[PDB]
């Protein structure tokens, strides 16, 4: 029977069923953004201490 097409952009496991590397790529992206956010907030703390 015909298969319902689900959007890989909004659905995660469909994106993985078509491309398993997207998982690792997204993990790297999320961790990188978290690290950068914490680094920026501590730099802001240092700047306000300098002020």
């Amino acid at each position: 029977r015909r298969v319902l097409k689900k959007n890989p952009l909004k659905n995660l496991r469909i994106m993985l069923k078509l491309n398993p590397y997207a998982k690792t790529m997204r993990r790297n992206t999320i961790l990188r953004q978290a690290r950068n956010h914490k680094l920026r907030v501590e730099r802001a703390a240092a700047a306000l201490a300098a002020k």
């Binding site: 995660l12 496991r13 998982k23 690792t24 997204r26 993990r27 999320i30 961790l31």
Partner: peptide, 11 residues
């Protein structure tokens, strides 16, 4: 869990 559906550590 990092975000729902994704684990923090690689395979």
């Amino acid at each position: 869990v990092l975000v729902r559906g994704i684990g923090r550590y690689s395979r």
